Amino acid sequence: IETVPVKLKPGMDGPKVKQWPLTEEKIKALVEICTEMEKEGKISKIGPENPYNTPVFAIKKKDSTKWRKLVDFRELNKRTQDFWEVQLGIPHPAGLKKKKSVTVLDVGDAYFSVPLDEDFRKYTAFTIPSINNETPGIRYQYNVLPQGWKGSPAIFQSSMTKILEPFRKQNPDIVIYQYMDDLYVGSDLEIGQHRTKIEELRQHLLRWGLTWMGYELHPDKWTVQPIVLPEKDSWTVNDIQKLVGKLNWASQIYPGIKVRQLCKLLRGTKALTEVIPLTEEAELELAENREILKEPVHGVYYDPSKDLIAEIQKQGQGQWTYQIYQEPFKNLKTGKYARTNDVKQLTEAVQKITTESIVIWGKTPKFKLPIQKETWETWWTEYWQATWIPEWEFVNTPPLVKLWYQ
Amino acid sequence: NSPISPIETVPVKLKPGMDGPKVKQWPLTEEKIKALVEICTEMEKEGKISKIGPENPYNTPVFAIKKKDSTKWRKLVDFRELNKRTQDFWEVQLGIPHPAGLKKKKSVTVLDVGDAYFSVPLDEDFRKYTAFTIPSINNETPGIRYQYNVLPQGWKGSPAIFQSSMTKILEPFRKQNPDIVIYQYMDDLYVGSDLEIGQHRTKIEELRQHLLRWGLTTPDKKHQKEPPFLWMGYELHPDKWTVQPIVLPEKDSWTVNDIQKLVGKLNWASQIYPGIKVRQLCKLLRGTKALTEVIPLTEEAELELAENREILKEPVHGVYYDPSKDLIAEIQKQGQGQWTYQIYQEPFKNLKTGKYARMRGAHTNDVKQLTEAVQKITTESIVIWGKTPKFKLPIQKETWETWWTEYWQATWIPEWEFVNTPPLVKLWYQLEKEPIVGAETFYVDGAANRETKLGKAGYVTNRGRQKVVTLTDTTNQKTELQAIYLALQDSGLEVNIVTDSQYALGIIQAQPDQSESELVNQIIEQLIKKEKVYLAWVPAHKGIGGNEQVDKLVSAGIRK
Ligand SMILES: N#Cc1cc(Cl)cc(Oc2c(Cl)ccc(CNC(=O)c3[nH]c(CO)nc3Cl)c2F)c1
């Protein structure tokens, strides 16, 4: 095909991102993979006059044993946003979150058929490192559309539309959405039928040369996590304090939350253990709050011009709570993930949350991750199975925000 | 003179939107102008440079220099302007090889490439920018002008293009000799094989010849260096390695410059000599400085330096790597937030040692520090050997599980085992999960005025006690930690404390055993002495009983 020209933004230059150290296991795995890709003309070696670099990793595809190459194009994605978001943006359907079942198909191989604009190829440079800096370490750039680059499906969009034209016409109540290397297919059908339609879709795809969650996603079986309040026969000064604290912070999110009566009960300087029977006023004030918490938040709406943030809290016992928002306390979504080690678990939550985020908004969020930068950066690739990588930053975000959510 | 390689040239470009350099040549002495003509003629003959006329509009200044007791002249070209204008290249070497990561070889040869940069051509399209000019006697007539055909000294692209060239030239040989190891470093190549010396001395030659067929000359068997190799501050013997000798000076008076260099010599030593410390020596440098100014040693610093001399007394060596075996890393606490470690494959023959002795933040505990140290050692091992080691740590498996399961940050040590080498890492107190019956409930608060900085800290308790101490040059944060500190002193062994400071709570819930803050360190001493502390939080200015009353006391003449 005639190659689509890609203009980088004015002012911005291509990525200069250092490669995180890899283990021998993964370096050998990458050397094997890159050799074949060279033979197949997908990548070519480059000289020192290419100053750019993007990191690479090796993972195992979700529930499998072969190694897969995963290029981290986060920088290059930021610096080419005008191309893929505005100039050739793939529109997100709101239908998708409503469907009974959504299936995720990897379609990244599609891209290796379409050549990449020769003037852009240098920006896709990357390095396979070596152990103990033995050798200078192997440098490649891409000749075809690379997996992980948000530009790739943007380009391929018109080819994907032809591939899917027959299927869509034959199935007008099935929603198909391309996000990066994956296709998202949603139907209201009986699950047996759904899977029959997926196999049918596989066969269409197969004719263009293309061979933390369950098989399918169930969006309509996603509902809120109410901030719940305990129910007891006997209450202590401490319990009330904890409750007022919990209620207090809740009132920044939910308008109408009230604690006037509750506070009245604590008047004095009382021992924490001393029990305190509730008055009719207060019990009714509590009941009123409890009503407000079950229901959704009024006034909070997704703004497509703003980044999504995700905060995650470690609840112990393999439990993790999480909130998605754009402006603090205007939560667009809240949830919980359950059940290994802290890092394995945390990476499972991130991928799960990201996936839901793609389904609901066609956007991944920037994660605030409760963990040491280095610990995270060493280990995450051991359990990562997604084809994409979200933006993350690291935080020390205690203390009772933890208790306020579970 | 010497060859120039036929290797393809690397296309090179100026930075977008910039034209080449056009710096004016400054007039020189006849002496220099003569030296330079002699040199450039000699270079032209050899192919390194070529004469070009005044058609070429670019110029870089040139200079000659000769040392005081000498007769050889040297040419210096000042490429600062061309370097500003040349593209960025790919960074040469991500790091430098550690000895401990070298695999032992039956025979090992070092080959320096002679005149490396002058042995490689420069992109023809780019030569024009390398123009310089030898000027006339008192700049009357126009000068003689030249350009490089090879990689110039001090040009921005030479290091990278050279390495790139050596790589491409080595590729074939490597493919046809997979069992031979060739390290690349600058002009050098280090070549190691397990072949018998006869076949090794053969293979070296095929290389030397393969290299020569691409214009790269190398020293012959007679001129080749011998074991032990001195290299980058290391000694590399046939089955061991060490740091090159360390001379700790003995001085009447120590200057900043003397101490700076000492810390460095020790820090360098720490990678194979176990137990090296530099904390007390580093503390001295934490000041206004002034290289030649003398700093008198403190007792702690003299004890530390003396202990370091003792360690350095007899020489110590490290073994080489063996990829069949595992790596075992042991860590020990030296106290003062100093940690020391050793990595071996067969005990106790160290591949290397090291130290971690860092302060991440302000408030911390040993369990956190040990995790960090483990994390640091793990990255180190991935860089040197390509795998992570099995750890052996002075922490009960029980102590570790309690910490991580209850702490709020994700944390994870890979496969490890407990080893009883005191001091052991423990937690020195824990906070109760539930209020304590029959314990005095202190409600504590602090307030500071922002203009005057005058604070008040105090409590009210359910037994009707109260106190209010006044503080000078303080802040809201400090008053709130004073408030908790008062409640700890005045209470007895069991106590409940209510506060409206998330700041205090957060610090204290992470179970710190050391701080940069003096007040935190006092609060710590107390928490250890207690038998049971429960510590709860209520939001401030909500009229929560108890909190409201201490709020009135501390606000008196401080805030409204
Ligand atoms: N100068 C220098 C230098 C620097 C480096 Cl990083 C490596 C180097 O060569 C070595 C290579 Cl390529 C591989 C292993 C070692 C460790 N030393 C040996 O194996 C070794 N063997 C013998 C004789 O059997 N002498 C030495 Cl030294 C090597 F020393 C030489």
Written in H, E and C, the secondary structure of B17-74 is CCCCCECCCCCCCHHHHHHHHHHHHHHHHHCCEEECCCCCCCEECEEEECCCCCCCCE
Q: Rounded to 5 degrees, what angle do the CA atoms A141, A145, A150 make?
A: 105
What CATH number belongs to B429-554?
3.30.420.10
- Are residues A266 and B157, on separate chains, in Cβ contact within 8 Å? no
Residue with structure tokens 């080419």? A80
**What is the third-level CATH fold of B322-428?**
Alpha-Beta Plaits (3.30.70)
Q: Are strands B350-356 and A43-45 parallel, antiparallel or unpaired?
A: unpaired
Q: Which of A111, A77, A88 is nearest to A1 (CA)?
A: A111
* C-alpha pair distances (Å), A395 with each of A313, A331, B41, B315, B540: 11, 19, 64, 45, 25
Residue with structure tokens 């401490």? A238
Instruction: State whether residue A53 sits within 8 Å of chain B by CB.
Output: yes
Instruction: State whether residue A247 sits within 8 Å of chain B by CB.
Output: no
Q: Which of B199, B200, B60 is nearest to B143 (CA)?
A: B60
**What does this entry list as its resolution, in Å?**
2.9
- SS3 for B26? coil
CB nearest to A266's CB, from B101, B408, B544: B544
Q: How far apart are CA B49 and CA B1, in angstroms?
A: 13
Instruction: State whether residue A113 sits within 8 Å of chain B by CB.
Output: no
Cβ-contact B218, B128 below 8 angstroms: no
Domain ranges in chain B with CATH number 3.10.10.10: 1-92+118-158
Crossing angle for the helix pair B476-490 and B502-509, to the nearest 10 degrees: 60
Pocket of ligand 1 (CB under 6 A): B 97, 102, 104-108, 110, 181, 183, 190, 192, 227, 229, 231, 236-238, 320
Q: How far apart are CA A154 and CA B57, in angstroms?
A: 46
Domain ranges in chain B with CATH number 3.30.70.270: 93-117+159-227, 228-321, 322-428
Q: How far apart are CA B407 and CA B423, in angstroms?
A: 23
Q: How far apart are CA B117 and CA B77, in angstroms?
A: 15
DSSP H or E stretch at residue B166: helix B158-175
Residue with structure tokens 């105090």? B458
Cβ-contact A183, A359 below 8 angstroms: no
Q: How far apart are CA A124 and CA A181, in angstroms?
A: 16
Q: Which of B226, B246, B252 is nearest to B237 (CA)?
A: B226
Instruction: State whether residue A242 sits within 8 Å of chain B by CB.
Output: yes
Please tell us whether the domain made up of B1-92+118-158 is placed in CATH 3.40.50.12280.
no
CA atoms within 13 A on the CB side of A59: 17
Give the residue whose CA is nearest to atom 9 of ligand 1.
B190
Q: How far apart are CA B280 and CA B298, in angstroms?
A: 8
- Are residues A129 and B94, on separate chains, in Cβ contact within 8 Å? yes
> Which residue of A lies nearest to B389 if distances are taken between CA atoms?
A23
Residue with structure tokens 């080749």? B224
Q: How far apart are CA A178 and CA A184, in angstroms?
A: 6
CA atoms within 13 A on the CB side of B204: 25
User: Known binder of ligand: residue B188?
Assistant: yes
Q: Which of B537, B478, B504 is nearest to B469 (CA)?
A: B478
User: Known binder of ligand: residue A307?
Assistant: no
Structural domains of chain A, with CATH: 1-87+112-152 (3.10.10.10), 88-111+153-226 (3.30.70.270), 227-301 (3.30.70.270), 302-406 (3.30.70.270)
Domain ranges in chain B with CATH number 3.30.420.10: 429-554
DSSP H or E stretch at residue A104: strand A101-106
Q: Can you identify the CATH homologous superfamily of domain B93-117+159-227?
A: Reverse transcriptase/Diguanylate cyclase domain (3.30.70.270)
Please tell us whether the domain made up of B228-321 is placed in CATH 3.30.420.40.
no
Q: How far apart are CA B195 and CA B109, in angstroms?
A: 12
Q: How far apart are CA A57 and CA B275, in angstroms?
A: 36
- Are residues A398 and B101, on separate chains, in Cβ contact within 8 Å? no
